[PDB]
């Protein structure tokens, strides 16, 4: 009944993949209880840093990547949710279920990647565990893993970036191409598709 109808919480930034130095590593910035509270209020006072955030809802955790002043992630993780911010919940600026893509204005303190113009096919996927996995581009939205991985290894990394050698954004990881639980390739939203959305 109407009086007891609930609202979904906000997406909450709970960590980042630190790419600032010579070593990529995951950092947690909020534990489970704080995450739950922040999802409910939508008020996140934490300082945000970096290009790749680790984000959570009540039920899932995944990644989000800042490119050209927008924090992007997958619809299959975020749905239509707001994101928590210092001033309360922030509404999506982009939503496209057909691309599996959503975006919010990039948090103050975040750094954005630049869309790649290199037209190069040697790529690098960054996972939620801060693994940097070489990927050979095989089409507009596909790349092959030079070393195949169990899908367990990739789960929770949707929303993270594929980067070129010079560190530009080439795409956003969307889905694993897998057989018998082994991923040989990845499917990604190309950055040009983001640029068109913008």
Residue ranges of the annotated binding site are 116, 118, 164, 168
- Bridge-based pairing of strands 122-126 and 101-105 is unpaired
CA distances from 33 to 86, 88, 128 (A): 18, 18, 20
Looking at residue 30, the DSSP 8-state letter turns out to be: S
Binder among 13, 74, 101, 116 for Zn ion (CB under 5 A) = 116
DSSP 56-76: E-SS-EEEEEEETTEEEE-HH
Nearest to 108 by CA among 140, 66, 146: 66
- Given the complex with ligand TSV, which of 24 and 177 has the nearer CB atom? 177
DSSP 122-170: EEEEE-TT--EEEEEE-SSSEEEEEEEEEHHHHTT-TTPEEE-TTS-EE
Q: Segment 95-134, which members bind ligand TSV (CB under 6 A)?
A: 100
Number of residues that bind Zn ion (CB under 5 A): 5
Q: Segment 142-181, which members bind ligand TSV (CB under 6 A)?
A: 151, 154-158, 173-178
- Given the complex with ligand TSV, which of 90 and 189 has the nearer CB atom? 189
**Smallest separation (angstroms) from ligand TSV to the CB of 62:** 3
- Asked if 168 interacts with Zn ion (CB under 5 A), we say yes
Binding-site residues for Zn(2+): 116, 118, 164, 168
- Measured distance CA(187)–CA(20) in Å, rounded: 26
| Residue 72 interaction partner, one of Zn ion, ligand TSV, none, beta carbon < 5-8 Å per kind | none
Residues in contact with ligand TSV by CB under 6 A are 60, 62, 74, 76-77, 100, 151, 154-158, 173-178, 187
Residues in contact with Zn ion by CB under 5 A are 116, 118, 164, 166, 168
């Amino acid at each position: 009944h109407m009086a007891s109808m609930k609202k979904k919480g906000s997406v909450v930034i709970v960590g980042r993949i630190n790419l600032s130095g010579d070593t990529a590593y995951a950092q947690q910035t909020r534990g489970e209880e704080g995450c739950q509270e922040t999802s409910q209020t939508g008020r996140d006072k934490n300082q945000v840093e970096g290009e790749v955030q680790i984000v959570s809802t009540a039920t899932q955790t995944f990644l989000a990547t800042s490119i050209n002043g927008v924090l992007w992630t997958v619809y299959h993780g975020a749905g239509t949710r707001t994101i928590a911010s210092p001033k309360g919940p922030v509404t999506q600026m982009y939503t496209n279920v057909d691309k599996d893509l959503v975006g919010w204005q990039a948090p103050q303190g975040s750094r954005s990647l630049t869309p790649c113009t290199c037209g190069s096919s040697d790529l690098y996927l960054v996972t939620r565990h801060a693994d940097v996995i070489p990927v050979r581009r095989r089409g507009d939205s596909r790349g092959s893993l030079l070393s195949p991985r169990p899908i367990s290894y990739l789960k929770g990394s949707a929303g993270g970036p594929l980067l070129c050698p010079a560190g530009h954004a080439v795409g956003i990881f969307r889905a694993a191409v897998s057989t018998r639980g082994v991923a040989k390739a990845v499917d990604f939203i190309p950055v040009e598709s983001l640029e068109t959305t913008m």
